[model samples]
Target chain A: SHPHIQLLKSNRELLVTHIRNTQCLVDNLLKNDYFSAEDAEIVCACPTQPDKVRKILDLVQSKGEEVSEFFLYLLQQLADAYVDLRPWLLEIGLE
Target chain B: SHPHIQLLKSNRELLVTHIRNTQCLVDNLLKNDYFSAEDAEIVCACPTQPDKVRKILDLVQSKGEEVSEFFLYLLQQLADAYVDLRPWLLEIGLE
Candidate 1:
């Protein structure tokens, strides 16, 4: 029970950190013309609906030219900000 | 100057929201064995260093099999969390 609780605590902390880091990435990306207004709306609604976000990102990935090294750099920063989730991100193909 | 301040204010607000949303997404992803300890450490260091984060994520991206739809869902959630940045995410190839 204690371990479970601990895990939950850690999870919460990590989640907050991850979200904060992603925000940093997004903010930086917004400075340029990386995303669109429709995209922004979808992203805003991600917490309650992740599948939609996934589809959008996947669509962008398919395009191959939308994401730049600089954008990837921001993503890397987001991944780094979370620390614990790095391996998970790696396991899921972040790099 | 006022418009600039307003834009700055909007930017700051959006940034904070984006971070919060991403945190939420990360928290959810951490619930499973998605990220590892080494990955966690790197993510934690993101604010001070984005390039390293980018490298790690890029490495993961190269693997191809590591990233699942579930993982993309989490990313989407993070993106959605930040409404203002949705278009930026889309522009970069989110969906």
Candidate 2:
């Protein structure tokens, strides 16, 4: 939860490259109501996973602070899917 | 435009980082009928110049080959406005 906007924004490219289970992240955001059905659709319409992830990040951040905080919440919550972000989550004190 | 999709796309983040006078870019695209009024509006609504430029590049690329080709055309035609892109344009064989 400590990453804040700075960490998240700074590592935008890293997250785009590393996040493998974007589907899970999108699902979490959708279920949590952080993302609308339209948002999910728009993300899906993008050309690639990285593009979808960038759209998701933009959507998440636009929803205000807690929305992105909830993203961190799910990073640890859905550990099995987010294998790639494990080291990053650990560094952000998400144990 | 010698700088094809590979060049434009490979240089995505760089174009986002560079490309000053995006206002002129928008105007050029608008006047050329490459972008709609809504497209220009969306670019203006974005948070920063970089965001606007990214929006422009995405819009330019989405309208297919010639739109981006026109982007290069203007890079040379409106040489005063696209100063940052000149070196890259020259590298792409633009005069």
Candidate 3:
């Protein structure tokens, strides 16, 4: 089992409510090859912000460990954008 | 443990999509005390058909076994209205 992927899935509900900087988060995911253009499109089309994060995390979990690690990295590196998740990252050991 | 409540939650997504006759469903739930007037009002205000079903099921699940049992009975008794749930009920052995 991929710990990183499991971390994303386990914290899905928590992250959905707290991940407010989705536009920037999604931008980084697409730029770094964690998600394809089509993936980003599907995530963006969701009705609400939390739903967008829900879709993004689902897609990340599906793509295997490499992609999920990159997603974690993006969330960590883009600190200001995903401020809400920093403590969450620490709590969940998103390392 | 309330088997009835579990059944309702287990097939929540399925019921949401197929429970099309919601107007009739809500009316009966209100009249029978399965739901308070406010419960019906909150359900009716949802933006989509599926959302209404989702809310109703959430409310039903929160009320515990007796209410859940009655909800199952209502779905079963009001056959034509909740025809979509009949097979699901049979499959789940909602007895």
Candidate 4:
């Protein structure tokens, strides 16, 4: 539970940093060994663990914040980090 | 426009702190005179100015993110700042 809290907090930090430093957010994900590629995918796809991707879609549907177009652009940079990690996870048999 | 940008940035800070530091955010809101109760209400009711409250609700509907229950609870703390400012504006006939 404490780790989950830390993950949630880190997610928020990444989101904020992505807003402030799009490149850095991506770089950190690409460089760090703390989480595997599969783990990164899990985080990107389903922020809440044990829930499938569909649940994330549902959650996004229910509570999406209509940020500025610029903000969306910033989020896409974060999305790219996950995108970059997918192939690595596939190679590692974790995807 | 620079000042408006500054306000947007500051608004994000308040939201972040309001999530992390409930009492402090309220204290700052009550202590500062820059944002009157009307301003707080306007921010709370419609984050985007020159727009109706409904637009904000619509915006929330369109892009809300389903944060954790704890996250929502934290947001309530942020909301309290607005609640505390209502009487101040009434005093100055600003609302």
Which candidate should be chosen as best, given lDDT against the real structure?
A: 3
Higher TM-score: candidate 3 or 4?
3
Please write out the lDDT profile of model 3 over residues B6-76, one tens digit for every residue: 77877676677656546556766776777898998899789887898899889988999888877766554
Interface RMSD of each: 12.5, 22.0, 23.3, 18.3
lDDT (10s digit) by residue, model 3, range A1-95: 78778767766765676555466566667766777899988987998878888888889888999888777665544332222222322332211
RMSD, model 1, all Cα superposed?
Answer: 20.2
* Tens digit of per-residue lDDT, candidate 1, span B1-95: 23322322333432232232243333444556565566656666666333433433433343344343454445544443333333333443431
Q: Cα-based RMSD of the predictions, in order?
A: 20.2, 19.1, 19.5, 22.1
Sliding window of 10 residues with minimal summed lDDT for model 3 chain A: A80-89
DockQ of 1: 0.03
- Candidate 4: give its CA RMSD in angstroms: 22.1
The TM-score obtained by model 1 is 0.28
List, residue by residue over B1-95, the lDDT tens digit for candidate 4: 23323322334433332232222222233344322465445546543322332332233223333212222332333332223223322432221
lDDT, candidate 1, A1-95, per-residue tens: 23322322333433333233244444455556666666666666667333443433443444354353454445544443333332333443432
Give TM-scores of chain A for all candidates. Answer: 0.42, 0.75, 0.78, 0.27
| Each candidate: chain B TM-score | 0.40, 0.74, 0.78, 0.27
Specify the CAPRI tier of model 3.
incorrect
DockQ of 3: 0.01
Candidate 4: regions farther than 4 A off: A1-95, B1-66
Candidate DockQ values, in order, are: 0.03, 0.01, 0.01, 0.01
Please write out the lDDT profile of model 2 over residues A1-95, one tens digit for every residue.
43444445766876676554466567667766778899989998998877887988888777767776667555544332212222322332211
Clashing pairs in 2: none
